Amino acid sequence: AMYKYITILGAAGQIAQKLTATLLTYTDMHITLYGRQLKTRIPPEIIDHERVTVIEGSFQNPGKLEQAVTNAEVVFVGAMESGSDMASIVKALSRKNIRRVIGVSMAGLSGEFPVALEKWTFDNLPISYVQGERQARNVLRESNLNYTILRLTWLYNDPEKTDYELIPEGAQFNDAQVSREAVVKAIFDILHAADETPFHRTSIGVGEPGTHYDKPSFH
């Protein structure tokens, strides 16, 4: 990896948990997991791993967040749903002068989906969720962070489908879906990128190739 110490914020999330297992199996990274009630949620083989540290708390707990990112070289933000939560995280990172962040957001906010997929997508999301995501993004942009935003299309689970393509900012986003396992691979690959340039304060889409559909199929 390009980093040794990573803090995963929102560590019980589906992508976060899969990322955790992948980083334990395939790297020598030291991982700090943060989120609500982790000790009674995260599997025992993860909690008891020598390279795992577990801290319980919410994105609105300044002291605990700061503890969680104290020794981080990179921070993964597992949800970007709330401006207020994003602000709390940015403030904690600022207090410890942590700079490198990878965050996951929803694709489509900027009109990048083609018309039918865009229509289906917004028919299937509350306005409040969408505008929350847009606000979280704005907060991250205002920060001093060397961030990468991953704009994810519709998610599903399939260990056999780990192919992904990155979609540059402003490009038409034609992929209607992507597996969580493929997103984990994309995160793994960015964490191993010798050249961070294309990921430096950029917003990149992640989609499954060949899923040019009018709606996600989730399989």
Ligand SMILES: NC(=O)c1ccc[n+]([C@@H]2O[C@H](COP(=O)([O-])OP(=O)(O)OC[C@H]3O[C@@H](n4cnc5c(N)ncnc54)[C@H](OP(=O)(O)O)[C@@H]3O)[C@@H](O)[C@H]2O)c1
């Ligand atoms: N569903 C889709 O198709 C889709 C597509 C694109 C993007 N996304 C979004 O991309 C993100 C990652 O996907 P995912 O499948 O891994 O979602 P996920 O399972 O819901 O994981 C998100 C995690 O963030 C945690 N979290 C959010 N706010 C928090 C707070 N204030 N304090 C502590 N923890 C907090 C949640 O904790 P708790 O479990 O304790 O509530 C949850 O475990 C999510 O934000 C998701 O909504 C979803």
Ligand SMILES: [Cl-]
């Ligand atoms: Cl704790």
